[PDB]
Amino acid sequence: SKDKNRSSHNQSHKAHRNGFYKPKKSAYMSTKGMNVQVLKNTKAQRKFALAKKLEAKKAA
Amino acid sequence: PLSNGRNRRTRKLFKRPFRGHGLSNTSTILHTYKVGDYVTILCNSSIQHGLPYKAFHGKTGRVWNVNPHAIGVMVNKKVNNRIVVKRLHISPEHIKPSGCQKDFLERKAAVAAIRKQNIQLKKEGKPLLPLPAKRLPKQPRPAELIKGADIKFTTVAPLKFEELY
Amino acid sequence: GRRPGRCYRLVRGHPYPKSKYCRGVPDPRIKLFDIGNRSAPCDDFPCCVHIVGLERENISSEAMEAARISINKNMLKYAGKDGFHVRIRIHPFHVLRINKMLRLQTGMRGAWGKSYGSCARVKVGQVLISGRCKEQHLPAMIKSFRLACYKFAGRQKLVISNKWGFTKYTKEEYQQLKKDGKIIADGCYFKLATTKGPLPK
Amino acid sequence: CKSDVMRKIKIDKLVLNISVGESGDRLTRAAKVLETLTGQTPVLSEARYTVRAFSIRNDQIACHVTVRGAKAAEILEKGLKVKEFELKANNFSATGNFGFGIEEHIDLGLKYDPQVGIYGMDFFVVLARPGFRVSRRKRMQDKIGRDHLLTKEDAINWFKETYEGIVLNK
Amino acid sequence: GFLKVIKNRAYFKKYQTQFRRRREGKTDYYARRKMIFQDKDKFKTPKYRVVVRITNKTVIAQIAYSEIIGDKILCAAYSHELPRYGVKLGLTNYAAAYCTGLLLARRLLQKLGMDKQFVGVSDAAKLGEDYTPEEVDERRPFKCILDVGLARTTTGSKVFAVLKGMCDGGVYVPHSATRFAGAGENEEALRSRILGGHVAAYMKYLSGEDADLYKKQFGRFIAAGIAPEALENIYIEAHKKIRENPAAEKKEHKKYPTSKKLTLEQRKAAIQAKLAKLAA
RNA sequence: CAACAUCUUGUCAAACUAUGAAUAAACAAAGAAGAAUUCUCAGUGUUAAAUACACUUCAGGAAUUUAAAU
RNA sequence: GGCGGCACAUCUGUUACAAGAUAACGCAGGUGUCCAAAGAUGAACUCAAUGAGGACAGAAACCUCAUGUAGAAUAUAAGGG
RNA sequence: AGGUAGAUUACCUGACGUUCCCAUCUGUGUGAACAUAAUGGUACUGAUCAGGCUCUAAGCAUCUUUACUUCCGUGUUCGGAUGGGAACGGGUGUAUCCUACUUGAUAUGAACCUACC
């Protein structure tokens, strides 16, 4: 009882019904695995800006 | 029926250009890549270490991270019915600067040059120049008149068949 | 036991030449491809005719051999040994496969084919056989060419070229150029007078 | 002020080679005869291809050595007096070198010993001109010009002058 | 006859020429691209090399960083300008190689202005021992790689006499002191060879043996009246006079045109003239 | 003679190829949120040192123009 | 169906259609290993072949010059380098 | 004009010859030490007696090659579409895209930083 093995027939029509789901913008903004020193520089500035902001919020 | 090897079907894809073997340029390793740039992945079979997968050959991507010896590249891959984001790290021997925005960067400079003169013209009170017109598909040609003194006529008719033997 | 000619007539499949992968190919039946006075200079035989195939099909090496013999005997009969030079312009570079069926210990459709023979995949308008002669033997040359076509399949066409004996130049172009020295005989063909390279002394 | 001084032909290298198939004892003696003949230790050559006809790849077969300068000249004089300055015209290469081979060696026949044996050497002479270094230097290696390169007749004239030895055309 | 020349058009249609400078035998592109590769995360920050080349008569030394347009030379010091500092003869010695390297180190720091805080070693007593320029206050020294080219780096090579000079000049060139004139013996061997001691023993040796050999090898020294003992003191003053004025120095050239090309008219006219004279 | 060179000649390749389409593949044609400029400008680090350069919501802040870019 | 074979885990070229995917008990072959060096690095050198020479030595032994885009070698199948 | 470093990697290569060297470069002299190998041939070091002989660089040739241009030729092939013709085999018309080999004409390098002339 041999059977047909494989076909691509009707596979592109199926794929375009709910068509190619593009990724959102947040998919291109990931920073996991970036440069180690660049990450250190960015974190150092963010901690500096945040501390200044919270100090000012404490004064008022 | 092929085998599922990593570098299957690359007798012609991974061959070097005719009379283009040996070492590459020096511009390839001296070109400076910055984040946000557009690059093209081009596997160099001459360098087998870190060779990118053959499915990314010819794809255009964007630089997302610069590491001491490798340049991060982010391309788009197509899956069953969706698209995923692929993040690779490729040495400059396998990538190449992309010219995809070369024409766009020309219009940006032309507009910026015009806008730079407008702040001068508005400062001095003169009317300001307009920005360059937008690109349009080849438009229908207008009415034209052809002078009758520098015109020659060539008669066109079906050609009598002649045997090629 | 040779299969009917209708089994291997249509041009089917990729070309299958004899190479390091295809072994055990029977030798082609045809071995001579130039007949007549093959060494006659270019100016001896001005007349030229062709056999032009009008079908896309296989021509087996048996048909080429059966036709070369037919023209050779006929042209020796009518013109003589030195009166003609007929060249066959198709070679059997294709190998046909046969899957032979012999009890109940037979895999029925589970097998490939063995090398069977040779043929040339011709196309429409291709020149199959050509030949050259003088004016005094053209009628005997055309007659022997018609008889050869009975050894082939499909439909053939006899064409009389307006050129010289296997040269691309027409009858009057050859006369003018040769008298100008642009044409240099080489025993059986010519060579154009080159106007390039180092100057002589 | 003529530049003829920059085209003076001179000996630049002389090679003596003894190729005997056997390895051991005789080769050790065949190496010692070159040490006495020239003055410097030779280099033992290995078999490039194994051939059963010659009973020969890892094994030492030959032992060649090259001498240059004044030492090369005097050994050439000894190897040419055996031939009595008689070199055939067909002994000269197309590139300006010549060579020959001998069976007996004068060596030291006073205390000649059969244990050492009898060996035959071959003499090959490589001539040159001042300026031939451009093909041998490490940096900016180039090719010598055709007119600067020697030829068979160039070597013949040198031989018939510096040694007066006539050349046979037989 | 039998030729079988492998130079036909079939050979050339597939021939692939090497890089032009490698075709000249002047550049090792396999090692050049190792010294040329700046880290990608250092955008356009120059990487400096000491290009040391020694000809038959002069010791060239330059400081170059590479760019796509070509190589740019930050500074360069030659040995043919050593006569301005009191060294007339022997411009390619181990001593003159040291002076050339020292001059470049002082000349460069003057250009960048950092010569006050980086002085290196100066006394002749400490010529033989290794010295690596170090951090001053919190300012790092000028770092520069050594480029040797197709020169074999033996255990006494001159290209390490230039390198030793720069380090004593205050420029940091990474190195190991196992290829200097020492690496065997001690600082006295390096120091003596730096002062021309190896040179200033041959004439004392040669004079004892022969007078013609002495005259043939050191002919210009005899005319200039430079004794084998004055060599040591000459190089001491050259180092002293270098550290106080390394700032380089300031007509129209006389060209010599050579052949010039032939235009299409002259090129075509000759062929017709050659064809005419053959119209034998 | 052959043989080997060399200049022509006729016919070829799914597991030969210099060259190489048509159809195709993946980008760009203005989203840290619709541009641009000017002034001001900090934290880390690169750096010989930086006023260079990199990242930091084109760090951040304020003015002027501005809805244009098949 | 059985007997035969493994298309059952797996690699190369081709079928295969110049993106990716991609059939048959399609075609031509391959794997269950081998390596303290055949891993890492530094230096030097240039391979196969051909022409011309050199005692034995010959078409095949070893030496020298010249030409030599890899026509050699790189553990293995094939394809890449 | 020359030399060092290069980027483009034959318009830069290969063969036949030709032109200067005034500086520079090269070739050239020697082997004491560092260092070098069987060989001061290489590489290393010391030098300046001579030379444009080679290199290098510049130019020549109905030169091979290579790089642009036309032509080959809208010819090969190709996407879309018949109740189009043919027994097959294969080959139209329509609205479109359009190579290659070859041949002929031209060229035989452009350009960057430093020093010296």
Side-chain angles (χ1 to χ4, degrees):
Chain A
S1 90
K2 262 165 83 187
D3 65 302
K4 301 284 233 164
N5 297 287
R6 178 216 144 260
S7 199
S8 277
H9 176 258
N10 208 71
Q11 288 330 302
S12 209
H13 163 261
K14 269 216 315 187
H16 278 97
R17 303 307 304 277
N18 319 332
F20 293 113
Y21 295 127
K22 312 170 320 168
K24 299 302 206 326
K25 201 80 155 36
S26 83
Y28 305 98
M29 268 154 204
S30 179
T31 186
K32 290 199 125 304
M34 254 186 176
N35 201 315
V36 182
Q37 185 54 74
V38 151
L39 282 196
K40 274 201 291 270
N41 300 349
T42 296
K43 169 174 214 154
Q45 199 270 327
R46 291 223 188 93
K47 251 164 120 173
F48 175 76
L50 176 54
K52 160 182 311 304
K53 174 154 302 162
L54 304 195
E55 140 205 345
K57 216 184 50 183
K58 177 179 318 297
Chain B
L2 275 179
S3 317
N4 315 325
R6 197 183 125 84
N7 293 325
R8 52 148 176 183
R9 188 127 207 182
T10 41
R11 172 193 198 122
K12 314 220 148 215
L13 186 84
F14 275 176
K15 207 210 149 186
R16 304 305 311 285
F18 184 69
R19 296 170 22 213
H21 302 262
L23 285 180
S24 62
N25 299 352
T26 322
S27 326
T28 84
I29 69 178
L30 286 170
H31 188 256
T32 285
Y33 295 100
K34 307 214 178 175
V35 181
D37 280 329
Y38 288 97
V39 289
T40 319
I41 306 179
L42 295 177
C43 325
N44 200 23
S45 35
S46 167
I47 307 290
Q48 304 95 21
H49 181 248
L51 194 57
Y53 187 41
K54 71 174 269 259
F56 298 116
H57 188 102
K59 304 273 156 287
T60 318
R62 280 196 95 185
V63 182
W64 68 278
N65 176 70
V66 177
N67 254 329
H69 300 303
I71 299 284
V73 176
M74 172 167 39
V75 313
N76 271 3
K77 197 200 184 188
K78 215 153 273 192
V79 161
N80 182 15
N81 71 325
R82 60 164 197 278
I83 291 148
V84 296
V85 194
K86 286 318 184 180
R87 272 180 239 284
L88 306 122
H89 265 110
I90 299 164
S91 102
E93 282 272 291
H94 306 296
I95 49 181
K96 192 178 81 187
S98 185
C100 63
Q101 281 198 133
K102 152 155 172 293
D103 73 290
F104 179 45
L105 292 195
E106 273 316 280
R107 289 180 258 120
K108 272 188 148 176
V111 154
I114 290 274
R115 277 204 203 115
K116 192 212 225 293
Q117 296 170 356
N118 273 7
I119 62 200
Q120 204 165 302
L121 296 197
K122 163 192 281 311
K123 182 189 64 180
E124 310 270 32
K126 214 254 174 193
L128 25 71
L129 309 150
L131 297 184
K134 69 178 171 190
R135 292 141 64 225
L136 280 164
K138 171 171 196 329
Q139 296 285 272
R141 44 109 188 158
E144 191 176 329
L145 187 119
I146 319 170
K147 274 75 63 162
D150 34 8
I151 286 308
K152 99 184 210 78
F153 291 95
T154 43
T155 315
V156 189
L159 282 165
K160 151 182 185 174
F161 171 70
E162 257 322 293
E163 193 62 270
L164 63 106
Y165 309 102
Chain C
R2 216 183 157 272
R3 264 185 176 162
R6 53 171 125 83
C7 277
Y8 302 99
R9 197 172 152 207
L10 308 185
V11 166
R12 303 285 329 196
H14 288 286
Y16 187 49
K18 165 197 179 175
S19 60
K20 47 154 143 166
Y21 314 100
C22 181
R23 304 161 209 85
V25 188
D27 312 85
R29 271 306 304 280
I30 174 156
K31 291 284 300 156
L32 294 192
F33 294 83
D34 300 68
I35 64 171
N37 192 10
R38 88 231 303 197
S39 34
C42 194
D43 322 329
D44 294 12
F45 306 150
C47 301
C48 178
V49 302
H50 310 284
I51 284 183
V52 179
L54 288 178
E55 269 187 27
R56 164 86 163 157
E57 51 146 25
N58 284 315
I59 290 189
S60 55
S61 67
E62 275 81 0
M64 321 167 170
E65 161 83 353
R68 194 252 310 150
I69 286 173
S70 169
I71 305 182
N72 196 28
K73 271 197 77 161
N74 271 209
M75 291 285 328
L76 290 208
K77 214 137 63 61
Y78 293 3
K81 178 53 193 165
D82 297 18
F84 73 110
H85 171 222
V86 174
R87 156 182 297 159
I88 296 190
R89 310 181 40 180
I90 41 177
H91 295 52
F93 288 146
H94 186 52
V95 180
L96 305 158
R97 263 151 319 168
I98 180 158
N99 175 37
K100 231 160 164 144
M101 302 285 208
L102 199 58
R103 276 207 101 113
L104 89 174
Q105 249 266 359
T106 322
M108 19 236 143
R109 287 220 37 82
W112 206 50
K114 277 204 179 325
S115 313
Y116 174 74
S118 304
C119 67
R121 293 148 64 109
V122 312
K123 66 175 168 32
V124 199
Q126 179 154 0
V127 182
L128 316 184
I129 312 185
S130 274
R132 43 168 199 154
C133 55
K134 324 168 174 178
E135 299 101 12
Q136 43 272 31
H137 287 167
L138 197 46
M141 171 82 155
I142 303 169
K143 166 135 162 163
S144 51
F145 262 33
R146 299 212 168 281
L147 298 194
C149 307
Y150 291 112
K151 321 261 135 187
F152 291 132
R155 177 171 136 72
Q156 276 78 27
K157 155 165 79 166
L158 219 44
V159 179
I160 299 142
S161 38
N162 55 349
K163 323 254 171 297
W164 204 261
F166 299 162
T167 84
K168 197 35 181 183
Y169 308 112
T170 70
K171 273 220 162 173
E172 81 305 347
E173 287 195 291
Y174 191 81
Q175 309 270 110
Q176 161 70 23
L177 291 192
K178 156 108 197 190
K179 96 169 72 172
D180 303 358
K182 315 293 149 298
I183 312 297
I184 300 107
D186 278 63
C188 80
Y189 204 49
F190 80 103
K191 211 106 72 165
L192 211 48
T194 88
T195 91
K196 287 197 317 194
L199 265 164
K201 319 290 160 290
Chain D
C1 263
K2 179 61 77 175
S3 53
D4 274 358
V5 73
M6 299 293 320
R7 299 178 107 246
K8 281 311 164 73
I9 302 171
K10 36 159 183 205
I11 181 140
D12 90 3
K13 180 218 300 205
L14 160 78
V15 195
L16 314 145
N17 172 44
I18 294 100
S19 46
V20 53
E22 41 159 346
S23 50
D25 186 81
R26 290 266 70 75
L27 259 201
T28 307
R29 302 308 270 264
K32 189 44 173 101
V33 70
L34 280 199
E35 189 125 11
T36 38
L37 181 54
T38 84
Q40 58 205 244
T41 85
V43 41
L44 306 200
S45 155
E46 287 203 353
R48 206 175 156 235
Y49 292 134
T50 206
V51 166
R52 309 325 308 130
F54 318 135
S55 317
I56 69 178
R57 272 211 318 151
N58 193 36
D59 39 351
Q60 314 313 85
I61 291 196
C63 41
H64 73 101
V65 84
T66 78
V67 289
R68 319 178 193 254
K71 190 173 281 317
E74 53 183 58
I75 307 178
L76 185 52
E77 173 97 52
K78 303 172 129 134
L80 276 171
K81 72 159 61 67
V82 183
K83 291 268 191 177
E84 301 276 344
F85 302 99
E86 208 77 14
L87 286 197
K88 262 149 183 50
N90 224 325
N91 278 43
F92 288 70
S93 171
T95 63
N97 315 347
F98 59 87
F100 49 87
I102 63 171
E103 297 85 349
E104 63 95 357
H105 37 289
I106 27 91
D107 248 20
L108 202 147
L110 191 99
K111 327 178 216 175
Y112 151 73
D113 265 26
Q115 34 274 48
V116 201
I118 276 293
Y119 303 102
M121 311 58 57
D122 73 89
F123 288 52
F124 208 75
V125 180
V126 196
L127 320 177
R129 291 206 229 243
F132 263 34
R133 140 161 185 113
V134 315
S135 155
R136 275 117 169 116
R137 56 188 188 200
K138 164 83 171 293
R139 173 175 179 275
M140 266 195 316
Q141 199 151 2
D142 319 303
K143 293 151 87 202
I144 315 135
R146 290 315 287 258
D147 39 352
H148 210 61
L149 285 182
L150 303 151
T151 301
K152 178 205 199 83
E153 79 267 351
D154 303 44
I156 276 177
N157 274 276
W158 180 84
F159 183 67
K160 290 195 296 203
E161 275 144 17
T162 81
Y163 301 116
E164 317 277 321
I166 28 74
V167 278
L168 303 176
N169 312 10
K170 51 171 298 303
Chain E
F2 333 106
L3 324 173
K4 188 35 84 154
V5 282
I6 61 196
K7 278 308 192 56
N8 29 14
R9 32 165 310 157
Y11 163 88
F12 281 108
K13 279 184 102 275
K14 45 181 293 214
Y15 189 61
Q16 192 210 317
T17 36
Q18 280 158 333
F19 284 177
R20 181 184 77 83
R21 269 193 87 82
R22 155 72 195 127
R23 238 192 299 120
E24 273 156 14
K26 306 222 257 191
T27 305
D28 182 11
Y29 279 101
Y30 290 91
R32 155 167 184 82
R33 313 208 320 168
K34 276 214 197 213
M35 333 178 38
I36 227 192
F37 190 81
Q38 175 80 291
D39 289 44
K40 297 319 282 207
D41 57 343
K42 305 182 185 161
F43 306 82
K44 258 137 189 163
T45 323
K47 219 201 181 147
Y48 294 106
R49 342 192 297 284
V50 187
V51 173
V52 178
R53 299 298 184 279
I54 304 186
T55 69
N56 287 332
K57 268 138 169 164
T58 317
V59 179
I60 311 166
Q62 335 188 285
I63 296 201
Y65 59 98
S66 203
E67 288 197 76
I68 299 195
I69 197 68
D71 270 30
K72 304 217 175 229
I73 302 284
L74 184 59
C75 211
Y78 288 66
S79 84
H80 60 64
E81 31 188 286
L82 277 187
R84 205 242 305 199
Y85 294 97
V87 182
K88 160 65 84 190
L89 288 159
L91 298 181
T92 75
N93 313 12
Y94 207 99
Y98 187 88
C99 296
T100 299
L102 163 80
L103 175 67
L104 221 186
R106 313 292 326 153
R107 176 182 275 154
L108 165 86
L109 299 176
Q110 170 145 1
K111 251 191 70 176
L112 317 183
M114 19 156 37
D115 67 305
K116 286 306 143 41
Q117 20 182 353
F118 293 105
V119 279
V121 318
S122 202
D123 39 3
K126 323 288 214 75
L127 278 178
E129 41 211 69
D130 211 17
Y131 168 82
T132 62
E134 72 281 4
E135 260 170 69
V136 159
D137 313 316
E138 288 253 347
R139 171 157 204 193
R140 300 203 297 247
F142 190 89
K143 185 189 248 136
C144 196
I145 300 314
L146 169 73
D147 194 353
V148 193
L150 310 187
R152 201 174 299 192
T153 57
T154 74
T155 326
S157 320
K158 285 182 260 214
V159 298
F160 298 107
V162 174
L163 170 140
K164 172 89 175 85
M166 322 193 33
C167 304
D168 300 355
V171 164
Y172 174 44
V173 186
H175 65 268
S176 198
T178 84
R179 294 239 161 271
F180 289 147
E185 297 290 317
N186 253 349
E187 290 85 340
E188 96 289 345
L190 178 45
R191 180 199 106 101
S192 72
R193 201 175 261 263
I194 281 185
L195 294 181
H198 75 309
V199 167
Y202 197 39
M203 318 136 268
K204 301 225 268 299
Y205 159 81
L206 268 206
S207 288
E209 322 317 277
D210 201 311
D212 321 330
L213 295 185
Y214 171 73
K215 191 231 211 165
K216 197 202 181 185
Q217 168 99 342
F218 296 100
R220 293 183 331 197
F221 280 68
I222 293 157
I226 313 170
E229 299 84 271
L231 289 187
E232 262 68 22
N233 226 316
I234 274 185
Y235 293 121
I236 302 294
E237 308 305 316
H239 300 166
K240 276 195 243 131
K241 272 185 279 223
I242 271 167
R243 305 190 138 251
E244 44 200 66
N245 194 304
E249 95 279 40
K250 192 260 174 150
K251 68 148 196 81
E252 185 254 349
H253 79 267
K254 170 163 201 284
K255 238 198 195 205
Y256 303 88
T258 82
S259 275
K260 291 287 158 264
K261 292 227 153 107
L262 288 210
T263 66
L264 184 51
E265 295 82 84
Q266 320 158 281
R267 172 185 326 131
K268 178 102 71 158
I271 303 173
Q272 303 294 340
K274 203 175 303 148
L275 270 170
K277 84 155 179 76
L278 208 53

